Amino acid sequence: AREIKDIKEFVELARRSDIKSAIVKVNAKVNANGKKFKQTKFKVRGSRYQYTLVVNDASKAKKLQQSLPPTLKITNL
Amino acid sequence: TKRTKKVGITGKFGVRYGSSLRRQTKKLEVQQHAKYDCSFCGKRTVQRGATGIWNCKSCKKTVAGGAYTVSTAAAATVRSTIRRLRELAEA
Amino acid sequence: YAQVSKTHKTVQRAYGGSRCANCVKERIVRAFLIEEQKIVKRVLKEQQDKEK
Amino acid sequence: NINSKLALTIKSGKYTLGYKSVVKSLRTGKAKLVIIAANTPVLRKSELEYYAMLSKTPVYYFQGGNNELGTVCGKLFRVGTLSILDAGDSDILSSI
Amino acid sequence: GRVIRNQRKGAGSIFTSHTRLRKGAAKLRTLDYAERHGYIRGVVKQIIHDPGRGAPLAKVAFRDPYKYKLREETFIANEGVYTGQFIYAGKKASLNVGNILPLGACPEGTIVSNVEEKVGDRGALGRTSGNYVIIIGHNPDENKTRVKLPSGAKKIISSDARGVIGVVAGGGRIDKPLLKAGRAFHKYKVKRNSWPKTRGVAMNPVDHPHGGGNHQHIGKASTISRGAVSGQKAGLIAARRTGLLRGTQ
RNA sequence: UUUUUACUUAUUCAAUGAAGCGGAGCUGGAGGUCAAACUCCACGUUCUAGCAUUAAGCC
RNA sequence: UUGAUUUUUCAGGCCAACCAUCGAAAGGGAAUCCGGUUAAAAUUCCGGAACUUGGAUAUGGAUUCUUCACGGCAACGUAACUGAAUGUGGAGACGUCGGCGUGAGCCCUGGGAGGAGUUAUCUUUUCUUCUUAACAGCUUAUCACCCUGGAAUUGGUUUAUCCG
RNA sequence: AAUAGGGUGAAGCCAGAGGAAACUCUGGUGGAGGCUCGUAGCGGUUCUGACGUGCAAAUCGAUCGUCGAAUUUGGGUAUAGG
Ligand SMILES: [Zn+2]
């Protein structure tokens, strides 16, 4: 499994022709220097690797989710 | 302090094998564990590997020597004998 | 080693993945100096091939 | 005799001890004489005298090793080669 | 009686030499055109320990005169030979320690080792540590050279036979006592199965001609004829004399 | 018939991936040259742990 | 081994030290892990996540008008970044003992969040859960090496005195 | 492939003390040895113990030897009846 850091690279990767499905995982975390925040992991399943993008911003996650290709099957966990 | 009066390196053998054999061992075993001056780099870093093999830690030169000394007296004589006979042939 | 890229198995220099830097340096200097003396021994020989 | 001349240069004149200092002094043209110990490796030796040929510097071949070359200079360490920058009260340059 | 321990060694079942750790056969180069007419130069790469041998071996790399290839030779290291030394072999090689020269090219008194009995056999005489061959004289009309072997024997060899200048390295090995049975065990662990030795006088009459008796004793003269047969040659075979050697021989 | 030593092809020993053998001739170094150039020797590698492979060149 | 030829013919170019074969379920050796599952199988099944070897093969990137890339004084760096015959090396690949150092697992222990036990008395108590695989990326080291500089009032330095 | 934990304390090294020199003494450090006490292991001394139609065609118990090497051991392999 490979982690993706660049959000722009992730959207270009999610529209690759071999991408079967996607996973949106929500983790209720806390930074211990504040209070609860909602982390989101976007996971793209390619032929060889699963690619994960960690989005700690609860608003950038929602914008990113609607920026994925509409054809991908998305599982919400 | 001085730990042993006379056995020295052969004190590892205890009381065994006979005193004459242990003092005969001591002479040649001090020589084989000594550090010798390197004729190549000038440092005193030459130690024995196996018999006849003497390596320098510094310059990594290996020279063929004696069983327990870097040079035997017989080899030193041959070195001068060969040197002398070489001069006459080459004038 | 068969399944890794070439940059992992070599160094960008002569004898890169085969010899160390100091041993390559000694080869270069030895090659230059010895070949320079080969010319000196040749011109000197030609000096003794015309007067003696 | 040259040992006495060399000892005087160390006492009164200028010098560098060591291979790296000698090569720098040949590059800068500050060397008047290069002294090489007998047990110096030939590759290092044949390179020092190539530097001296380019630099037009005389070379003196010491008869002892780097242990004996060091002690002539009044040093408690080994000197494989040295360069004379300024022969002072001595006359080593006129004899070599 | 029974087949005695002398005779069981020829079959060579458990009496072959232990040769796993040996570093190759020590030989001179094959006598070729370069050695017959000029000299060839090699460089000492290694000086190594050969298990079962007192003398260290030298690995010397030569160029092949006829094809692009390196040839590694296994020489017996003479004392004073060092790694990185240039070794010269041939008729025109100079008289320096480690060089391989024909016997006729060496003046009288030259100390030489790994000498050829016959031209091209690549070394037979004076190969053990501390040993050497002295050149006594030459007979140029017959192309022969007189040498003295480590045993004190005088031999006449062809002047084309080769030898290596110097003394075999590793000498003085015998000066130190072994002090232990374990030291002899380790000595023969990489040579062959010849240690330890049971005395034949301590066996039974089946095992040895010396076995048996109500005291341990040989019973008959232990000097055995040269014409005796296998199973009889136990003791001093063809002994010209016996007893403590007194005076010169 | 016996003794000795000459030959090499039988026979025997050894080596090599059967690489340079034997003779002669080119080139120098020499003999003192007493015809006329005969005889002898050599005939590309030695401060250095480099390199030498799949011919350049000329006709 | 190539250029092939479709002329199913070939043209050649290199080599020929050594090389039948058998011989290890403890030697050498390409590549997999976790969770779950059976009455009985599991590194084999299921779920997920990887890897190696062989083959085919396109796209992107890279490179070329100074044709077969740039940077760094250097040790060397990188996403790539021609290379036949032949050759040279390295890895495979190596005893034993001694103390020292680092890591991992285990042992010990504090706080907190749970569960169980003792509770005539005492015990903020006794026991227990609090875990993280192969694999991918970045970072991380003794040793070794490079540049600078030129050292006696010798200095650095290990438990073990070696280095300049 | 296997071999607890101790004792002793060889070379080498550091420091101090004494001496004109040749050299000597002391305190540490170090960790040698077919060394030593002693487990596992390997062996098999004595009880001339048990048993002796046995648990056993060689065992059981205590006692004992040795225990870092000439050590112990698996597998592969070789040696075949005068
Ligand atoms: Zn050295």
JSON list of N, CA, C and O in Angstrom, two decimals, chain E residues 26-28 76 113-118 121-128 133 149-150 155 157 162:
[
{"chain": "E", "resi": 26, "resn": "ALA", "atom": "N", "xyz": [51.10, -26.48, -5.50]},
{"chain": "E", "resi": 26, "resn": "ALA", "atom": "CA", "xyz": [52.17, -25.51, -5.69]},
{"chain": "E", "resi": 26, "resn": "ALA", "atom": "C", "xyz": [53.06, -25.97, -6.83]},
{"chain": "E", "resi": 26, "resn": "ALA", "atom": "O", "xyz": [53.71, -27.02, -6.73]},
{"chain": "E", "resi": 27, "resn": "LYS", "atom": "N", "xyz": [53.09, -25.20, -7.92]},
{"chain": "E", "resi": 27, "resn": "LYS", "atom": "CA", "xyz": [53.88, -25.55, -9.09]},
{"chain": "E", "resi": 27, "resn": "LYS", "atom": "C", "xyz": [54.42, -24.27, -9.72]},
{"chain": "E", "resi": 27, "resn": "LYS", "atom": "O", "xyz": [53.86, -23.19, -9.55]},
{"chain": "E", "resi": 28, "resn": "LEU", "atom": "N", "xyz": [55.53, -24.42, -10.44]},
{"chain": "E", "resi": 28, "resn": "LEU", "atom": "CA", "xyz": [55.97, -23.35, -11.32]},
{"chain": "E", "resi": 28, "resn": "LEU", "atom": "C", "xyz": [55.05, -23.27, -12.53]},
{"chain": "E", "resi": 28, "resn": "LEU", "atom": "O", "xyz": [54.19, -24.13, -12.75]},
{"chain": "E", "resi": 76, "resn": "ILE", "atom": "N", "xyz": [55.33, -21.59, -4.20]},
{"chain": "E", "resi": 76, "resn": "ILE", "atom": "CA", "xyz": [55.75, -21.66, -2.81]},
{"chain": "E", "resi": 76, "resn": "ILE", "atom": "C", "xyz": [56.46, -20.36, -2.45]},
{"chain": "E", "resi": 76, "resn": "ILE", "atom": "O", "xyz": [57.42, -19.96, -3.12]},
{"chain": "E", "resi": 113, "resn": "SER", "atom": "N", "xyz": [65.19, -22.60, -4.52]},
{"chain": "E", "resi": 113, "resn": "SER", "atom": "CA", "xyz": [64.18, -23.49, -3.97]},
{"chain": "E", "resi": 113, "resn": "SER", "atom": "C", "xyz": [63.17, -23.85, -5.04]},
{"chain": "E", "resi": 113, "resn": "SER", "atom": "O", "xyz": [63.11, -23.23, -6.11]},
{"chain": "E", "resi": 114, "resn": "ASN", "atom": "N", "xyz": [62.36, -24.87, -4.74]},
{"chain": "E", "resi": 114, "resn": "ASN", "atom": "CA", "xyz": [61.38, -25.43, -5.68]},
{"chain": "E", "resi": 114, "resn": "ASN", "atom": "C", "xyz": [62.04, -25.76, -7.02]},
{"chain": "E", "resi": 114, "resn": "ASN", "atom": "O", "xyz": [61.58, -25.35, -8.08]},
{"chain": "E", "resi": 115, "resn": "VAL", "atom": "N", "xyz": [63.13, -26.50, -6.94]},
{"chain": "E", "resi": 115, "resn": "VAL", "atom": "CA", "xyz": [63.96, -26.80, -8.10]},
{"chain": "E", "resi": 115, "resn": "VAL", "atom": "C", "xyz": [63.37, -27.98, -8.86]},
{"chain": "E", "resi": 115, "resn": "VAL", "atom": "O", "xyz": [62.83, -28.92, -8.26]},
{"chain": "E", "resi": 116, "resn": "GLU", "atom": "N", "xyz": [63.47, -27.93, -10.18]},
{"chain": "E", "resi": 116, "resn": "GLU", "atom": "CA", "xyz": [63.01, -29.01, -11.03]},
{"chain": "E", "resi": 116, "resn": "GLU", "atom": "C", "xyz": [64.04, -30.13, -11.10]},
{"chain": "E", "resi": 116, "resn": "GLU", "atom": "O", "xyz": [65.21, -29.89, -11.40]},
{"chain": "E", "resi": 117, "resn": "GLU", "atom": "N", "xyz": [63.60, -31.36, -10.82]},
{"chain": "E", "resi": 117, "resn": "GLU", "atom": "CA", "xyz": [64.42, -32.53, -11.10]},
{"chain": "E", "resi": 117, "resn": "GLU", "atom": "C", "xyz": [64.65, -32.69, -12.59]},
{"chain": "E", "resi": 117, "resn": "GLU", "atom": "O", "xyz": [65.76, -33.00, -13.03]},
{"chain": "E", "resi": 118, "resn": "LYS", "atom": "N", "xyz": [63.60, -32.50, -13.38]},
{"chain": "E", "resi": 118, "resn": "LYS", "atom": "CA", "xyz": [63.65, -32.64, -14.82]},
{"chain": "E", "resi": 118, "resn": "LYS", "atom": "C", "xyz": [63.06, -31.39, -15.44]},
{"chain": "E", "resi": 118, "resn": "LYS", "atom": "O", "xyz": [62.21, -30.72, -14.84]},
{"chain": "E", "resi": 121, "resn": "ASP", "atom": "N", "xyz": [59.09, -30.21, -15.03]},
{"chain": "E", "resi": 121, "resn": "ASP", "atom": "CA", "xyz": [58.21, -30.89, -14.09]},
{"chain": "E", "resi": 121, "resn": "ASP", "atom": "C", "xyz": [57.63, -29.94, -13.05]},
{"chain": "E", "resi": 121, "resn": "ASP", "atom": "O", "xyz": [56.83, -30.38, -12.21]},
{"chain": "E", "resi": 122, "resn": "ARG", "atom": "N", "xyz": [58.03, -28.67, -13.08]},
{"chain": "E", "resi": 122, "resn": "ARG", "atom": "CA", "xyz": [57.41, -27.59, -12.31]},
{"chain": "E", "resi": 122, "resn": "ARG", "atom": "C", "xyz": [57.72, -27.67, -10.82]},
{"chain": "E", "resi": 122, "resn": "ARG", "atom": "O", "xyz": [56.92, -27.23, -9.99]},
{"chain": "E", "resi": 123, "resn": "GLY", "atom": "N", "xyz": [58.88, -28.22, -10.46]},
{"chain": "E", "resi": 123, "resn": "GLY", "atom": "CA", "xyz": [59.35, -28.15, -9.09]},
{"chain": "E", "resi": 123, "resn": "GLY", "atom": "C", "xyz": [59.27, -29.44, -8.31]},
{"chain": "E", "resi": 123, "resn": "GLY", "atom": "O", "xyz": [58.18, -29.99, -8.13]},
{"chain": "E", "resi": 124, "resn": "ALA", "atom": "N", "xyz": [60.40, -29.93, -7.84]},
{"chain": "E", "resi": 124, "resn": "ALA", "atom": "CA", "xyz": [60.44, -31.15, -7.05]},
{"chain": "E", "resi": 124, "resn": "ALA", "atom": "C", "xyz": [61.22, -31.02, -5.75]},
{"chain": "E", "resi": 124, "resn": "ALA", "atom": "O", "xyz": [60.82, -31.61, -4.75]},
{"chain": "E", "resi": 125, "resn": "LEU", "atom": "N", "xyz": [62.31, -30.26, -5.75]},
{"chain": "E", "resi": 125, "resn": "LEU", "atom": "CA", "xyz": [63.29, -30.30, -4.67]},
{"chain": "E", "resi": 125, "resn": "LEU", "atom": "C", "xyz": [63.24, -29.03, -3.83]},
{"chain": "E", "resi": 125, "resn": "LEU", "atom": "O", "xyz": [63.06, -27.93, -4.36]},
{"chain": "E", "resi": 126, "resn": "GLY", "atom": "N", "xyz": [63.40, -29.19, -2.52]},
{"chain": "E", "resi": 126, "resn": "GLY", "atom": "CA", "xyz": [63.47, -28.07, -1.60]},
{"chain": "E", "resi": 126, "resn": "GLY", "atom": "C", "xyz": [62.21, -27.24, -1.52]},
{"chain": "E", "resi": 126, "resn": "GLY", "atom": "O", "xyz": [62.26, -26.03, -1.74]},
{"chain": "E", "resi": 127, "resn": "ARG", "atom": "N", "xyz": [61.08, -27.87, -1.20]},
{"chain": "E", "resi": 127, "resn": "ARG", "atom": "CA", "xyz": [59.80, -27.18, -1.19]},
{"chain": "E", "resi": 127, "resn": "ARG", "atom": "C", "xyz": [59.23, -26.94, 0.20]},
{"chain": "E", "resi": 127, "resn": "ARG", "atom": "O", "xyz": [58.22, -26.24, 0.31]},
{"chain": "E", "resi": 128, "resn": "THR", "atom": "N", "xyz": [59.82, -27.49, 1.25]},
{"chain": "E", "resi": 128, "resn": "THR", "atom": "CA", "xyz": [59.27, -27.32, 2.58]},
{"chain": "E", "resi": 128, "resn": "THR", "atom": "C", "xyz": [59.90, -26.12, 3.27]},
{"chain": "E", "resi": 128, "resn": "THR", "atom": "O", "xyz": [60.95, -25.61, 2.87]},
{"chain": "E", "resi": 133, "resn": "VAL", "atom": "N", "xyz": [68.00, -25.27, -1.99]},
{"chain": "E", "resi": 133, "resn": "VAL", "atom": "CA", "xyz": [68.98, -26.02, -2.77]},
{"chain": "E", "resi": 133, "resn": "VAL", "atom": "C", "xyz": [70.16, -25.10, -3.06]},
{"chain": "E", "resi": 133, "resn": "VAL", "atom": "O", "xyz": [69.96, -23.94, -3.45]},
{"chain": "E", "resi": 149, "resn": "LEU", "atom": "N", "xyz": [71.12, -30.95, -2.06]},
{"chain": "E", "resi": 149, "resn": "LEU", "atom": "CA", "xyz": [69.75, -31.06, -1.59]},
{"chain": "E", "resi": 149, "resn": "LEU", "atom": "C", "xyz": [69.69, -30.91, -0.08]},
{"chain": "E", "resi": 149, "resn": "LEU", "atom": "O", "xyz": [70.70, -31.07, 0.61]},
{"chain": "E", "resi": 150, "resn": "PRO", "atom": "N", "xyz": [68.51, -30.61, 0.47]},
{"chain": "E", "resi": 150, "resn": "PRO", "atom": "CA", "xyz": [68.41, -30.42, 1.93]},
{"chain": "E", "resi": 150, "resn": "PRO", "atom": "C", "xyz": [68.86, -31.62, 2.74]},
{"chain": "E", "resi": 150, "resn": "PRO", "atom": "O", "xyz": [69.24, -31.45, 3.90]},
{"chain": "E", "resi": 155, "resn": "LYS", "atom": "N", "xyz": [73.39, -33.77, -6.37]},
{"chain": "E", "resi": 155, "resn": "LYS", "atom": "CA", "xyz": [72.61, -34.20, -7.52]},
{"chain": "E", "resi": 155, "resn": "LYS", "atom": "C", "xyz": [73.07, -33.44, -8.75]},
{"chain": "E", "resi": 155, "resn": "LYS", "atom": "O", "xyz": [73.50, -32.29, -8.67]},
{"chain": "E", "resi": 157, "resn": "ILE", "atom": "N", "xyz": [71.71, -32.08, -12.31]},
{"chain": "E", "resi": 157, "resn": "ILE", "atom": "CA", "xyz": [70.46, -31.73, -12.95]},
{"chain": "E", "resi": 157, "resn": "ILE", "atom": "C", "xyz": [70.77, -30.99, -14.24]},
{"chain": "E", "resi": 157, "resn": "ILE", "atom": "O", "xyz": [71.83, -30.37, -14.38]},
{"chain": "E", "resi": 162, "resn": "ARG", "atom": "N", "xyz": [64.54, -25.32, -13.71]},
{"chain": "E", "resi": 162, "resn": "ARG", "atom": "CA", "xyz": [64.28, -24.02, -13.11]},
{"chain": "E", "resi": 162, "resn": "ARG", "atom": "C", "xyz": [64.20, -24.14, -11.59]},
{"chain": "E", "resi": 162, "resn": "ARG", "atom": "O", "xyz": [63.99, -25.22, -11.03]}
]
